[PDB]
Design an enzyme around this catalytic site. Sequence first.
Site, PDB file in Angstrom:
ATOM      1  N   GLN A 152      27.535 -46.375  13.755  1.00  0.00           N
ATOM      2  CA  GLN A 152      27.679 -47.698  13.150  1.00  0.00           C
ATOM      3  C   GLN A 152      26.689 -47.988  12.017  1.00  0.00           C
ATOM      4  O   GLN A 152      26.833 -49.017  11.359  1.00  0.00           O
ATOM      5  CB  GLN A 152      27.536 -48.784  14.229  1.00  0.00           C
ATOM      6  CG  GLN A 152      28.814 -48.993  14.995  1.00  0.00           C
ATOM      7  CD  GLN A 152      29.898 -49.673  14.140  1.00  0.00           C
ATOM      8  OE1 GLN A 152      29.890 -50.902  13.978  1.00  0.00           O
ATOM      9  NE2 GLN A 152      30.836 -48.869  13.593  1.00  0.00           N
TER      10      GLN A 152
ATOM     11  N   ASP B 242      14.880 -50.965  20.569  1.00  0.00           N
ATOM     12  CA  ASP B 242      15.378 -52.338  20.491  1.00  0.00           C
ATOM     13  C   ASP B 242      16.066 -52.599  19.149  1.00  0.00           C
ATOM     14  O   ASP B 242      17.154 -53.188  19.099  1.00  0.00           O
ATOM     15  CB  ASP B 242      14.227 -53.338  20.725  1.00  0.00           C
ATOM     16  CG  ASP B 242      13.015 -52.716  21.473  1.00  0.00           C
ATOM     17  OD1 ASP B 242      13.219 -52.020  22.482  1.00  0.00           O
ATOM     18  OD2 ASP B 242      11.848 -52.929  21.054  1.00  0.00           O
TER      19      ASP B 242
ATOM     20  N   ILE C  21      31.063 -47.177  20.312  1.00  0.00           N
ATOM     21  CA  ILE C  21      31.244 -46.413  19.072  1.00  0.00           C
ATOM     22  C   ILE C  21      29.920 -46.036  18.410  1.00  0.00           C
ATOM     23  O   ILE C  21      29.837 -45.002  17.733  1.00  0.00           O
ATOM     24  CB  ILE C  21      32.135 -47.182  18.063  1.00  0.00           C
ATOM     25  CG1 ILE C  21      31.507 -48.532  17.704  1.00  0.00           C
ATOM     26  CG2 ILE C  21      33.603 -47.326  18.583  1.00  0.00           C
ATOM     27  CD1 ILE C  21      32.272 -49.293  16.621  1.00  0.00           C
TER      28      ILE C  21
ATOM     29  N   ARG D 104      26.031 -46.067  19.549  1.00  0.00           N
ATOM     30  CA  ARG D 104      25.230 -45.139  20.337  1.00  0.00           C
ATOM     31  C   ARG D 104      26.115 -44.111  21.024  1.00  0.00           C
ATOM     32  O   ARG D 104      25.746 -42.934  21.132  1.00  0.00           O
ATOM     33  CB  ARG D 104      24.398 -45.920  21.364  1.00  0.00           C
ATOM     34  CG  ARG D 104      23.338 -46.784  20.686  1.00  0.00           C
ATOM     35  CD  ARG D 104      22.548 -47.633  21.659  1.00  0.00           C
ATOM     36  NE  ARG D 104      23.216 -48.890  21.882  1.00  0.00           N
ATOM     37  CZ  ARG D 104      22.687 -49.907  22.552  1.00  0.00           C
ATOM     38  NH1 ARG D 104      21.452 -49.814  23.081  1.00  0.00           N
ATOM     39  NH2 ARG D 104      23.410 -51.008  22.684  1.00  0.00           N
ATOM     40  N   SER D 105      27.277 -44.544  21.532  1.00  0.00           N
ATOM     41  CA  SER D 105      28.223 -43.595  22.110  1.00  0.00           C
ATOM     42  C   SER D 105      28.583 -42.501  21.114  1.00  0.00           C
ATOM     43  O   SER D 105      28.708 -41.326  21.482  1.00  0.00           O
ATOM     44  CB  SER D 105      29.489 -44.332  22.558  1.00  0.00           C
ATOM     45  OG  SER D 105      29.197 -45.109  23.689  1.00  0.00           O
TER      46      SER D 105
ATOM     47  N   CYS E 104      28.607 -47.637  25.337  1.00  0.00           N
ATOM     48  CA  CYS E 104      27.482 -48.492  25.012  1.00  0.00           C
ATOM     49  C   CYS E 104      28.031 -49.909  25.086  1.00  0.00           C
ATOM     50  O   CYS E 104      28.731 -50.237  26.051  1.00  0.00           O
ATOM     51  CB  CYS E 104      26.873 -48.126  23.646  1.00  0.00           C
ATOM     52  SG  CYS E 104      28.087 -47.747  22.321  1.00  0.00           S
TER      53      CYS E 104
HETATM   54  O1  LIG Z   1      26.263 -50.557  21.555  1.00  0.00           O
HETATM   55  C1  LIG Z   1      26.540 -49.964  20.461  1.00  0.00           C
HETATM   56  O2  LIG Z   1      25.861 -48.962  19.986  1.00  0.00           O
HETATM   57  C2  LIG Z   1      27.703 -50.445  19.607  1.00  0.00           C
HETATM   58  O3  LIG Z   1      28.615 -49.647  19.234  1.00  0.00           O
HETATM   59  N1  LIG Z   1      27.659 -51.818  19.306  1.00  0.00           N
HETATM   60  C3  LIG Z   1      28.542 -52.577  18.495  1.00  0.00           C
HETATM   61  S1  LIG Z   1      29.578 -52.080  17.433  1.00  0.00           S
HETATM   62  C4  LIG Z   1      30.190 -53.411  16.864  1.00  0.00           C
HETATM   63  C5  LIG Z   1      29.587 -54.542  17.493  1.00  0.00           C
HETATM   64  C6  LIG Z   1      28.535 -54.004  18.522  1.00  0.00           C
HETATM   65  C7  LIG Z   1      27.622 -54.915  19.405  1.00  0.00           C
HETATM   66  O4  LIG Z   1      26.950 -54.389  20.338  1.00  0.00           O
HETATM   67  O5  LIG Z   1      27.545 -56.198  19.152  1.00  0.00           O
HETATM   68  C8  LIG Z   1      29.963 -55.931  17.143  1.00  0.00           C
HETATM   69  C9  LIG Z   1      30.900 -56.163  16.022  1.00  0.00           C
HETATM   70  N2  LIG Z   1      31.783 -55.042  15.726  1.00  0.00           N
HETATM   71  C10 LIG Z   1      31.251 -53.709  15.810  1.00  0.00           C
HETATM   72 CL   LIG Z   2      32.663 -47.811  10.451  1.00  0.00          CL
END
Ligand SMILES: O=C(O)C(=O)Nc1sc2c(c1C(=O)O)CCNC2
Ligand SMILES: [Cl-]
Length: 282
Positions: free
Chosen positions: A262, A181, A219, A221-222, A215
């Site tokens: 990320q 989570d 970017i 988890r992917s 995901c």
């Molecule tokens: O699902 C993921 O691992 C993922 O890349 N999530 C991301 S990356 C990313 C966001 C999110 C989100 O889910 O809010 C929001 C703002 N910009 C970058």
């Molecule tokens: Cl980045």
Amino acid sequence: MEMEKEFEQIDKSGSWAAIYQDIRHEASDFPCRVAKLPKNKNRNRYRDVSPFDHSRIKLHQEDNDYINASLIKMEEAQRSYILTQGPLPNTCGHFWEMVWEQKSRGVVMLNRVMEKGSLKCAQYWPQKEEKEMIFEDTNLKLTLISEDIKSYYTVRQLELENLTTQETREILHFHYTTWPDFGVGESPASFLNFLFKVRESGSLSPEHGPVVVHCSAGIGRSGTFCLADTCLLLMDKRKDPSSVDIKKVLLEMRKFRMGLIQTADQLRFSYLAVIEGAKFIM
Ligand SMILES: O=C(O)C(=O)Nc1sc2c(c1C(=O)O)CCNC2
Ligand SMILES: [Cl-]
Ligand SMILES: [Cl-]
Ligand SMILES: [Cl-]
Ligand SMILES: [Cl-]
Ligand SMILES: [Cl-]
């Protein structure tokens, strides 16, 4: 091996944040002109996550070719992936059109449709056999054939039908339902077992189009999934299997889509996964 000791050195020196920020600083910066056109504003889930022009997937039907999706072509590891955002209510037809046109066999989903009470991805596949989905804009039909629900992931057999030709294809839907989570997992065991199930399915083989991985933004988890998969391929291919530099592989991947991995925790988790996974393949 040596990589496992490099991991321990980063942990004692507390250097994860520093290494991750070096990656962000050195990352490729290519134009995303198409993604940023006014007419594509409602095809992007996050305004700060866009495909580069050079690697974006182009839809083949007539009016607007745009989807927020990138072809990641790992030349040395000999594997390709399509990384895409979780589709929006208005891009589900585009999503399955891409799966059709790119000849993908598997779809890898790494998020839940709702997380912490926020919508992260549209309900883009049917949950009930008798309630198939029809995407009228791209003329596709999608039917749940069966699903195998396990403790840490679910695999669904989907039938995708091109209503134009009445051709049908079996799509395997690999849904990792248990990504932690907050933060990352203590252990990469469950994530690695999921990766190996995707591999065992044949969905990643070169006889098929590239697997579609997503995901929420496609970017974070992917990126973890593809980075681990690619590094483990390189560790098995090279006669010097510890010449695999995870940072270098991630930078190579980031030539094809921005922002892969990320957080510093996800970078740490990726190292953990590659370390434990390389031992498993031994
Ligand atoms: O699902 C993921 O691992 C993922 O890349 N999530 C991301 S990356 C990313 C966001 C999110 C989100 O889910 O809010 C929001 C703002 N910009 C970058
Ligand atoms: Cl980045
Ligand atoms: Cl425009
Ligand atoms: Cl879900
Ligand atoms: Cl494989
Ligand atoms: Cl390398």
